[model samples]
Target: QEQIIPKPAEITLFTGSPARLTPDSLIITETQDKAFLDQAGQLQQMLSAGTGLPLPLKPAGQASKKAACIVIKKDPALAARGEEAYSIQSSPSGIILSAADARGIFYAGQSLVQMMPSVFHDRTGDKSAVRWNISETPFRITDYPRFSWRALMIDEARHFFGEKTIKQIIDQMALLKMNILHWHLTDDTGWRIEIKKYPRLTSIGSKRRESEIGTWNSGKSDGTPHEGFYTQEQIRDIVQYAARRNITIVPEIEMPGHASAAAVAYPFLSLKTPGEVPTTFIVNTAFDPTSEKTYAFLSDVLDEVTAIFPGRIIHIGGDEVRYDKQWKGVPEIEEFMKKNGMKSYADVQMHFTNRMSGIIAQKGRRMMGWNEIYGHDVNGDGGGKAGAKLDTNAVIQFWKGNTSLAKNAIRDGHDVINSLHTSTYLDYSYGSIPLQKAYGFEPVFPGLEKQYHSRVKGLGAQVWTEWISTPERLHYQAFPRACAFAEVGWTPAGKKDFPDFKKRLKAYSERMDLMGIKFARNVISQIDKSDFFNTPRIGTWTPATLTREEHSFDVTKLVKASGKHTVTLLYDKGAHAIEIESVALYENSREVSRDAHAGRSGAHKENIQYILNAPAPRQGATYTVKANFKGAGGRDSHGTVYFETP
Candidate 1:
């Protein structure tokens, strides 16, 4: 079978002679519609790069018997087949691609590109040019997506990837048949979009003094300024660029929270002026929710945003609002809350969100925000009395709060995008969310009735850029796994097969390699040490824990550092439970006791981390130590040793 990244729904081989696509093939389309014109040009461009021949695009009437013709046209019947559905049928002379819309046509073209020899993707002319011919068994295939809101969100607010990188991402997303680019453009790190109404937003808010080096801003700095913002002209060009590929750009303008950049630019927007834009990720700079002026400022900003992005939705980030810090104890806010009959600051957030939803609706667009817009306290697992009702029209993005929160939203007849952080968050390590785990994600909340499944708009693979600072790292963390999400969102659950998908990855990686895309190799269970955490404060130890005979742990990598260091032990759940009191570590005859946030280790594997002040091991060698667990023997728990920056 021919390998396709997002496997097509159906395929059948024909008994006819093999179809050969060559440099002399004519891309003939009946329509003179500009959209199809662009597609024809794109098809010509893709083939010309590999075949090293100018593939002529011409009207269907001009086709001759001399050259095999790749016929392209629209079939309105595909609309009933599926959203973005298309079909390919082997034609007598060549092949035909038909779809209901331009998006479908574009997708069909991508599938055809995959059908070509892998060398057809070489655009740099690195090797001597040859007339590449893609020979394939004549076949017919019908395909369509399972969901409508297939997306990959990039947090440019944390780390700005330029126009070129963004376009590259869109290019890859198009190949996967993904439809949405959730561009996170504003946050504490920087304001990344130009707004004529707010000049300071770019002049001041777009530049940061420095950046934190490790987790929780452990008093380390890169000591270099970071800056950039997309000009309005630039955004318009990029937006149309994505549209041509059937991807919609949804720009996220964080409000109420993650707004330090915007608040720093316009101080009056916040309850109190921040000392300066933070050097680390912080969520305290929420826009003042009690004032009319703040609403006016946001409305003005959204007007520009709505104009710049032509998508059906605008994401006003409404997560991580620190009400405990500033939204309470203020006489002004208290009055507003009471006037609205609000019980807690949570309720106040709901009120603010509803108002924004209404404002966004008035502008002919729906508002989207994190599930926090439902007024759930994420830190508490969102398990309290629901603070307030939410507007049904707003698309709720379920990332990190609680599964029950998503259930409730769907129950209330709201549309939702499932990003459940543990599975879909691209920043998570391989140990946390392996390719299998990501591929296993289900967008619909389990136990949800079939009818409510439609409310689960789709899934989004989110790559937040806090730890992912470089473009190379971004690709490493997102691909292969991002490929898993691509299938998760497009392939029906019943159709997905991990082993088969793994087989397909070998083929897909070649396309990515041809495009110069960097992705993770074999780093599963093993660790990828990051520069931010390369400090002496971090080290790993794996050796003689001379306890009862333990064989479950395959740890050979040991840890011994000159000074303060961090160690993590990855253990698989066995016959017994774990107790922190029973665990101990010693270095150079000195006992140590310290711990940081361990992790949400799974049933298959559990990881516990320790931070210790210890004597250096004998110079140039690791020190073996005993791990004393009070209860059962090593059969109860077995683990490997490794450390990460956090």
Candidate 2:
């Protein structure tokens, strides 16, 4: 292997007088506000990490002469251009560049990092040096981002992230030049955004009666409970913080379906059935479209939401609705549809959607929803024949598995966002398909190049709560993996290369660390281990002896255990709040416990205890013990140990 420079020179300090075109020098300037010092600090750290360079901070006043240093101005006119814009120029002087604002300055730094030579950064080891060769010239380059909806969605409903973490997210987004924070504010598991009109939405809805441990729709109340919410003022503060970085906060308040959180807060919202409503996370009902009260409640809530977020787009979730309940029980919905000259449950649902969209428009905003708003079967009237035909002003985010829907949606003159699951669903375990599979996903619909390029605005990868439940795991599932999607979103089609993408992503590992983000770096290594041979790779095999009663097994934990073990693990036969696959055990090893249960494999239970009962060779066995529990996906993937036993 070839050795690259270990570290780069620090760019922290400027001595004597400030000048623009000095060789081997970087200059940053801001007028009026000294607050840019923070952005400067961020830039310095990022550059050092990216180029293996060191940056030293120096306090200097005014410039002696005009130099080609990087200049960041905070003028309002320039701010509109966003943080992703920067100019690189070469003249008789060194490189002269300007940014639209501090945000632009940060993006320019990232671009500079990308242009540097590749070098290995061993984060666990002592930081090393990296060198860059610069040929100074009169190079003048001006650039800005093309998309307005660059976003990173945070699912606070399933698992809550603190305010500090949220701001940290803003920092990361700013670094990537993403301009929107598409907050999935509410979901079946938890409700995060505050609604004053209905305090229960937060007070009661945010708190689950009890957690369902492992599987989908697992029974509730495992004794432990979870809860969280952001006040309207706090949300406003967050929006401003993002706004300062040129990021818009787009909140996704669910609709007809995925309304279990809402239903829990106010029972009437759900289709009133015979059974008792679950006090915890359960995808059991859709909004009762027949009820006049539903409209009044939503209308009032949305009025508050529109008042807070000045942005034109408000997300009204339109996905995974169980129509059986409403279609079977709701009589008023049919009457309302008849009065409105509509037909079928689809039309009635559309009527509710249109009603909300109309309300948003009245508040000077447009509505957006999951692609399901187009209906389940696209072949019929393009899934829009119902009362849904009433509007095209709203945008539809196609998160369904179908790809052609993008074309169909565009043909109908609707603005569309392609988010097909095969490629964009991050909740899928990398262990199953691996990171490369995700990296290979193309969000743009094929055959409809025009729609993908023009009518189809862009793509969004969703992090559903089925598996994710913590911030750390969320970061693991998102970062690095999400970076691939980000590149796909920004890079023009022909420019993408899988091998090259992986190589470039190596740089992001350092950037993530520098920004204090917790992302899994062992993903590729795990994939490599599993792919070593054509045969199926065995991940971790616990000792069969441990499962036996009246016996003790002390096998140490293996860092990355592979191969079959005699132990047959037994998982919860009943619906668990958590999946057994989330559990990992280890004994006497230096590494933490490995995942003992193969939840992803869909094994309900493994009788490891029965396997442990078998005879062993001799006495005086030595082993360390440890165990870990798996949490929700898109949160963090770190397994938590239960305990080690002999």
Candidate 3:
């Protein structure tokens, strides 16, 4: 490997006079003269930082006339025209970075910064630079993006992203080179995009009666409620603002199976009995496939959507259909399938979906759907290869956690957009694996180059906003990582290095900070302490009083040594159920309560602090505790305690 050294001088940034400098060289400039003054200062600061040498900014002889320079205006009309454009140049005397607008200028600056030696990047806090030496050669260079499909998808259906959060995301996407915003605007769980034609979609379908809680344990759903949606004008405004950055906004209106929001809004649209609109959230329901009125309603709503977003692709989510409910007693769907000379329920869905695709296509647009459209089972639960045949004009978006479906989609001659959920889905726990895991996911699959050769069109990252509700957490989850995805999607495969990537990522984080977005810390310190021991390791003490009418108990014990101890109390549930009321551990005559979150009764896992000291052996000692419950049910309950050494 070769090493390149940076110029040995420091530079300074000025805000008209004196002010604290931000790391990004991101001093905000309002005009050409002011910006020129600041750029000189920033360059000097960069040189000083790079070379371990000091260089102060001074009035440069009233802006040299013979030095030869060029100015490029940021393309404001291109934004109005919905096209992203940029320019890069290096003349005899100096380099001129320009854009069609401020956004273009920002992007040009980023490109210019990347072109510098790794030494400059190191001084500026970015890691190893990309192979950008070609940028610094003594030659005039100019460049711009070609396609309109550059984008990232944020699915607020699985979760929800609020207004502020959405704007922050737009900022991050613009900061990178992405120009298309594919908002997965609707799904089974909720409807997020507003449609004026159907006010009920927002009014009635925005919330469910209850949400599932506690990891779906016991198959019991959470009784908690949630609801929200964007207004039509809001969507339009979002699109226009995005357009200002040469970005197009593509709205995903999921259809057919992922129509729970619509069905919930209008029960008449389903095969089941017409019911009252839910006041809470529910996840496991779909529209009745037997209804013709459903198709009419979808057509009208989509007509409105098409008018709103003139973009070419209309997302019709053809995934996660519940065949169990729709197929149980309805022979008409199957008859309809046979009547159309089609095969099964999958064909019926394809039939329903084909209608949607035809409608959208008739309006001069294309349709996209999940890989399930091409006939792999929902959730990859193994429906065999039954649904592999699909509408060729429709693009298949592969989102399953595995690559098999993607390979199948491409092998079957379908245009495939590879977005594997496990790697690209940002909704999962960020703590599970660091950003390195995300950057390492190269979309190419092994032994499947033939499929890649056939239909693999592009790669995308999906930030499903399930747990992400705030803008800060959203940026923390998306940016820097999305930067990696951008490289994966645009940069050729096999050109990524993790350590080198992290170095650039650190610099990217500095940019994020300058933009005032929040992100997760570089290191995680919290640990789940409960996983250290197994059940039944504690000793049971006798002489405990059990109150059968109420779930309560009282115990007295003594500990005299400074070591770990485990305590247990057992009670049988006949006609009574009990819970721990209060636990007090005494050390050297000082008492501390062990019933964590003693006054509160909600989730308490994050607040339980560990005990610091244990009592020494008592020649004569006593520890007192009290326990109580609101009521009793017939069940066995126990109180147990365990401790770990520091």
Candidate 4:
């Protein structure tokens, strides 16, 4: 029998004969729960398609004539088990699934589907080629999620994924029993949702002249126009589709900062000088928060957005606003701040956030934003003007890779969601967060008072697709890591074991393959050549340090390499000419390879790629490869050396 992805909270095996399910078995339900019925219908459709046998759905007790049946019904005794808790008991006679609410029933159905042949998940598999029978061992399983909110955020704004791809993602999330889809719908790159109040948001803001290729500072463009948006009707459809699977779609409408797309759509909405839609991906340009016109425009947009997404929470990205220069330089903003008794630019952002929260409250929805919404003093003195005085009711999504912020939010009596970029941001390469790191994430911060534990609602994994362009790339980045996140969100900390989880993942990869999800299967094990500092025009650069980087790989897999391995380093002179002096590779404290260049002092104008070869190391030994480089003109660079199989 295959292991469940999120090991159940409690399970007991029985000595009785295992129940056998045949094509004639019936799926019956006692409760008239529409969501349950809809989910059951979905199972029926999938089973019928896979087995070429029509499985009938009948009301519970009405299907008594069936020899074997799957019965779904509410158990009043389990009412205190919470809405997401469920119990499953399989016997020789039939299977009984009990839950307090429809969500639990839906999760129960997912477990049942998992129990079926893995081929059932393969849409392209021949129906007649696989066995449809399920041998249910006699057991009673009681399961419930550790956190109420298990979410995955997909940033479609940076690179739009049409409704089909979005639905595919939804399907995968549902299979994992993840309950929240944090739909990031807007960003500096583009706005991806249709709004009737401002048609240009999609018409103009959705399409970019060309996408920034390679890296953010690369100064490169594919020259191919990128455009896509979900219509109001499409959003409505997705909402309904997710509802059947007990998933809530939380729409993130970026505000104050990351609103350059909105600014381009309507010039008056901008704090910066208005221009055409921006092709470059950058932050700090935002809407003129002081303008009542800005408020009205956002209110209209939110009205349309709220109507489409009926979820209780709306995420307004109140993060990373470079306000010092933008707000102080603008007389109108300065006057508004002075008139409003706001002392600092943070205060201005607070005023804007609070006012926006009021509008969201008026629409009968709660507001959520990044941890920056809870401002901190820039100076270590902690005496500067306090900003980000958000409404007490607002939800804080902590993504600043800081646990202190989450602790502060909980202390401030606000609901918090842990999405620390270090562990939860899926867009970060595997070298940054390997599978174990993602799986080891704990939503609640340590040393916090136990009383405030509930305030930390759950965890969210984000995929910010600034560089992730294609659907295959998106899947490759998200999965295996996402599976780790799913287990992190659903399973209790005490019940989690990485080795055990990996054992299940080895099988789960087959399911992902069957579903056509192009996950990063070997990222946790294989060493791949990755580029750094390729683009020098945009990001921070240090002349003293040529490159500081790190790469992580599994030790067990590295030992499997049979022969010589080569580590390659590619260096670019950029606009400043420099000469390479030496390149060396270190495994932890031990230097394994070195190349000293005595006569290589000539100024190299173009980029140079160099290679270093070393014999394979012993098995069952973890190694950290560090590359150190010394160059002329105060140019020194250091990074991790990832060896390619030779």
Candidate 5:
């Protein structure tokens, strides 16, 4: 049987069968529901395009001599099952698709598309030679999502992707049954959407003189100009395109910080002197929160935004706002803080968020912001022990801090989206979030009270494009791993199995290939350390390790190749100097190459490069690599290695 992703909640098979679909098969619907008719038309078009066999759609009870028919009907019985729940039953005479809502019917059609032969999904496949056969076995299946807010965030503000790429991502998300597209449209470096009320937003904010070359702290520029933005018309078209696929586009406009681009356009809005569009990646004081003109400006901008995106939610970036320097020595802000009885800068930011929330609510939309909007003690100084008060109606997107942060927010009766960076940040290198780790993610953290589980809206996978600069890099970083989170949001927790998911992924990758996605093939089966983290410049490494030891890593899958191959390691020394004893590589437990370091010690601050040449590894076989190291004292650390193909 062909596997379906996000495996259905219940499925039962029967002996009855219908061998295949023919041109005579009628897509029948009762009551002539327009939504059902439209979706059926889409299915008809897909089948015709793939098989060159025209299928007919008609109302139920229409006369037809066809052997089998596909029936779609609205079932009141499923109304209690929820908005996106669906049921399918197949028999020798016909097949029935039942759902309580249009979204359910649409998803039912998607599942049916998956049930067809893989060739149908392969756009490059030769349709003339393909067999358009589908499973004939009769079965009954019922399915619904565990959460309603499964989302994927794309940070186009950091690196712009054209409309074509954005649409392609939406199409793929629809195939995975993902319901939300968190479109990050503004940041410190760029503004990616036009705001007609603020003409300079796109004119001056969208373009940067140059981009920071390597890391955020690198203080180097590439000296090449960059710019892009979507016009209001284009945004409308994209929103309609996503709506057709049952995806909502939530636009994010940064506030308080990460708004240097906006400041570039209108210097008066910034706390500091605004010059050219930002060429570096650092947060700066954004709009003056105390200024009434700032509120008026944002409100007008949102007026245009609300008209373009009809979704009920708007994301106001309320994260990483540095107040010490931005708000210091400003008499107006200081006076305002004193008037409001604000104890700390965080309190001032919270006031800004609440005001924005009220403004968003006035625009007939709900406000969503990063977890910082919840106002925890971020500085570790305990200055503001209790977070500032906020409107309970606003939703908090939890990306940083511990589970306690989310628990506290839920206790305060605010809705939460679990976007924990450790598990769902896609931009992290493969060593950090391999397929296994992503697949095992449970959105509702353990130890949280079961009663507040409903407040935990869903899972969100983020793709921050700070390092990803090309379309291929975007695809490589998002797929397969994003596929894991799709299931994490839809399938019941008890039914998740990583091994089974891997098996399904093996076949799903073919569909990605047909769609021209260049996904990463390497799978890190095991890692010896838990504290390792990936840095923009150093790939992946640990800060420090005092003990002398040996570590092993299993590379279960390698890129397909022949003859000789080169394995490159990109790494950097930690703060403490350390000695590397030996580095060895093995193929299927057989030693392939070994390197010994004698009278060699790594400098504390330079990036080190190493390469090893070996005969072609056995095809479809696993390989293991080991590193032995020695160090002394608390600050002493061993060099970290990130294996990659050259």
Candidate 6:
């Protein structure tokens, strides 16, 4: 069964004797191009693990034709199909793999490995391992990606996964034919890539004293300190490693904002000095765009960044820039704004961003930023700040906000990569984006003009590592969903089959198991999970609010009518401290469950606690639970009510 995670474009199977791979199999390539040689070496490694035989690479130019060999050659007709287009034919005699280029060759290689037994990656070298393989069914597969950019993002700024983990992620990404690794190297929490010009970017900016891991709701904590940064050598090694795997590493160096970590290293970078590197989740520290010194510092940093990352694309994190909190009232900021005719902080931001675009362009690289770079209305109030026009070629990464913004970007001919946070953020609980929901994501929406649809470059999935502090959790969040997105980005939309994908994933899970990857077992969303990130689906899930009065909850449909259940009222106490006076449960008009005073069940302010000082509810009976809440400190107040059944 060839249960590939990203189902191939086309396959033809023959009911005949299966082809056989043996210890004497040769990896034959027509050209000695580094790429062909590179993939041959990788195939050799696979053979070493799968059949315990080191398959020797030979140039097809040699007259000696091996009967049982894997042949990789280039075909211009296939190249005309696409750079990543490839074809494979396997029969009882030999296997022939042809591609337009090395990228397609690499993908064909991955498919070859997948066709082998699930134990192909196991290095045990036991004789029984060969028994599991060489039963390969004769077939022909013609494959090509639906989109050019299939990417995965890992935000190491919040929590670094180190070199080994990064490479592991690359290996997995390559296996699925995913092409890009969007490395979020800097953010408020820390700077993950070293800058030679600004040594503190790593030394002082990379280390955090503590984290609020268990206490994001409280704003501070004594969680363990996290510190790590990659040296230039390590960056080069990783960059080349990914290039060999046909993956581009687009490093994101946050600019003008998310500069809290940079602020700690150089206080002058910000309008107001940050005391130290903050462990808290959302600190409002940003670089002082109004100052020329800040520009010089950032320029030097980007120079080092450009030198380290050889890719044409560089991600300038133009998202969540809290310009309102820090720079508005400062005199220097005001003076600079007046000088530049900037109407809002976004205007100033655009001015700073426009400068960054030119800076990166001068270094022969294009800038890719989050959707907030649109600078139309910073607050989404439709009151846009008019300022510098965005550079024509900058790539827009649409993570959140109005689809109109993405539409506008497309209308203006800017390339877009859809990573809609709700569908793409791996950090969200599994319940928010189950495998089915993830598979449902489409980068090109229905409203988009068919002509402009090609501008919808592709899609990306991100694991913002704020709460995911370890490799195990990272893999858990990224695995099945990443596979879902891999299909989203590669397989033709018309050809996608979620039910088939579900079946294929079972086999895929065993492959991950072989690699010892700790992936989440369940891809189903839990409707009752916390509503911290404004999750979707309201009745089954809600952002419901209750005011200063009696609120009634029908507990009938919440749980099984026969079993003992815990009816829960989970509400946020942030807006106001809502007070509760009475609690009552009734079957019709007759009261069924309540405390000694019946409806008068004492007064208390509540969060996610149960207020049941009552009897066992009747089986086979419906219930309507009622509660009375009154305002205490003489003020208008409300709270978000989340009715849950346990």
Q: Evaluated with lDDT, which candidate comes out highest?
A: 5
lDDT of 1 at 15: 66
All models: lDDT?
A: 0.75, 0.57, 0.55, 0.75, 0.76, 0.76
Model 1 regions lying over 4 Å from their true place: 15-17, 32-34, 64-67, 126-135, 381-387, 523-646
> Would you estimate the TM-scores of all the predictions?
0.79, 0.66, 0.61, 0.79, 0.80, 0.79
For model 5, the stretches where C-alpha displacement exceeds 4 angstroms are: 16-19, 63-67, 379-387, 524-646
Worst 10 residues of 4 by lDDT: 532-541
Report how far residue 333 has shifted in candidate 5, in Å.
2.8
Q: Candidate 1, after superposition: displacement of residue 126 in Å?
A: 7.0
Off by over 4 Å in 6: 32-34, 59-67, 125-129, 132-136, 378-383, 524-646
Q: What lDDT does candidate 4 reach at residue 642?
A: 36
In TM-score terms, candidate 5 sits at 0.80
| Deviation in Å, model 1, residue 190 alpha carbon | 1.3
lDDT of 5 by residue, 1-646 (tens): 7577877777887775533566577778874667877867886776677666666887779735555677888886877767788888776567778888877887876777667676776666557655444455778879888899999999999888879999989978988899999999999889988887788989998998888867778977788889999999999999999998889999999897788888888887877746787777775655798888888888998999999999999999888776666775678778987998877777888888999999999999999999888887553432253347889999999988888978998999999999989899999877898777888888886788989898998989999988777889999999879989999999888888776677777777777777777877654222222323321122223543334357566654542443333322322455555445666667777777776653233443221333455566576777666666555333444445555553
In model 3, how large is the Cα lDDT of residue 153? 88
Report backbone clashes per prediction.
4, 80, 33, 3, 0, 2
Off by over 4 Å in 3: 1-70, 73-87, 90-94, 97-150, 158-162, 209-225, 273-282, 341-343, 378-388, 401-404, 431-433, 450-454, 523-646
Per-residue lDDT tens digits for candidate 4, residues 1-646, read: 6378777788888775665566677888778877677667876776567556666898767665456688887776776767989998887688888887777877887777676677777667456655543444688889999898899999999999888888888888988889899999998888999998789899998988887778778989889899999999999999998987789999999888888888888888876844766777765477898888989989998999888898989999887776764566789987886798877777777888889999999999999999877776432222244554668899988887457767877998999999888899898888899887898899899878999999989999999898888889999989989988888888888988776677778777778888789998675332122222222111122354544322223333443444444444333334333344444444545656555553232232222333444446655455543433444455443223234554
For model 5, what is the error of residue 164's alpha carbon versus the real structure, in angstroms, after optimal superposition? 0.1
Tens digit of lDDT per residue, candidate 3, span 416-507?
Answer: 77777777776565666446667666565666875255466666677766555456767677765677666565433444455455555665
Give the per-residue lDDT of model 6 (tens digit) for 111-178: 87777777777645475446434335778899998889999999999888899999999989998999
| Comparison by TM-score, 1 against 2, better one | 1
